Write a protein that binds this ligand. Sequence first.
Ligand SMILES: [Ca+2]
Ligand SMILES: [Ca+2]
Ligand SMILES: [Ca+2]
Ligand SMILES: [Ca+2]
Ligand SMILES: [Ca+2]
Ligand SMILES: [Ca+2]
Ligand SMILES: [Ca+2]
Ligand SMILES: [Cl-]
Ligand SMILES: [K+]
Lengths: 206, 237
Amino acid sequence: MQVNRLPFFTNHFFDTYLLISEDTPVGSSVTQLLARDMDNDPLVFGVSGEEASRFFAVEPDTGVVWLRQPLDRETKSEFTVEFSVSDHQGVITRKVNIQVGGVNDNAPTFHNQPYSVRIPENTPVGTPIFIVNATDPDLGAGGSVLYSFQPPSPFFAIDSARGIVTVIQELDYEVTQAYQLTVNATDQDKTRPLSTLANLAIIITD
Amino acid sequence: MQYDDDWQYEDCKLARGGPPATIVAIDEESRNGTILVDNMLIKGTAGGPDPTIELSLKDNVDYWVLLDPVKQMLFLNSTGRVLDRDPPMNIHSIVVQVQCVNKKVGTVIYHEVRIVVRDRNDNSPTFKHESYYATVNELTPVGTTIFTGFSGDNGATDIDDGPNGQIEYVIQYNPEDPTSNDTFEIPLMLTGNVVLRKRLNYEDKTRYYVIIQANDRAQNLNERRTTTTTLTVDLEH
Ligand SMILES: [Ca+2]
Ligand SMILES: [Ca+2]
Ligand SMILES: [Ca+2]
Ligand SMILES: [Ca+2]
Ligand SMILES: [Ca+2]
Ligand SMILES: [Ca+2]
Ligand SMILES: [Ca+2]
Ligand SMILES: [Cl-]
Ligand SMILES: [K+]
């Protein structure tokens, strides 16, 4: 009489990692578990543990793995999930490292708002008067911020990388007593750049 | 005229499509100088006499990574040590940032590199004790489990991950005690529990030397590792 031999996984992703993009839609298949059994037993597949059961579901008869709720690289860049396979006599499990792939899905957020500054009408051309800052949590180009005025002002410029605002033309209180400028902070994602607006009030004094 | 100057912003962006992170796998215990990333594929020229970018490493915990800015290549730095995935070191991955500063406009882009370290079968099964023992009564029925001393990490363990670290137990023929592998059996190799297979006779034979070999479950049969112990079984009257 032959004793039962338990099944074993054959996927090579168990020896490295499984990469899943954070923009993967819920319901989508992300891979298929594969296993073998020396008794040729029909196998049933599942997900096992808390974090795994949270994000993944498994078709029990095929081993297709599918996304039960959305991933978010900004929250969790990688994690470990345990899958099971059973020949109805015993259950074995194995862990896989999930690497969560990034896409640009946040716009920048400004720091230290509201933005307002009072400056004298005789502020010389070239004078830095204000610094805007915004951050963005996406990877790479999608996380690197550029600043601009929308539209550009003939009286003020903002450094595209540093957010430093300077006077570029002589001021005149009697002509303009205050400027309401829109600052745009954009990321630099190639295909889907995202951006955010803040107001900057510049009040000219006497 | 708007966006005429956008060429100025190209340096430091990826010179490839695809996702922003650069992810690679390398074997644990790879030799110093092993290539981690052959080419970061970042637009621009670092170093040389007229660079358009500056490249440097950030969050390089324990300095595992070395950068060559001219070639945009990343290497393993492991002189005087080893990149060990197994306990006690437990290095499963290394994550670093390649900071890129664009010299012309001063923007900074961070290119994340994630290195997943893969397990090698570089450890053999190790027994907790140098030898094992069991006492069995002569009237013990055939089919009775007479030794369970490999339970709960008291037998062989293996510090690798996955099947590399899973153990199977088998009894071997003992040329110095030929009937021992006929009198005892390990029917379930995963537990290594030993069961009586033939009726004992105290008037005939009072001691058995059972040779037990533990092997790990590496996918490649030629990479499997084995270790051997002896179970001495003494009869009581
Ligand atoms: Ca089976
Ligand atoms: Ca996200
Ligand atoms: Ca993102
Ligand atoms: Ca972004
Ligand atoms: Ca090791
Ligand atoms: Ca091993
Ligand atoms: Ca190992
Ligand atoms: Cl991202
Ligand atoms: K182990």
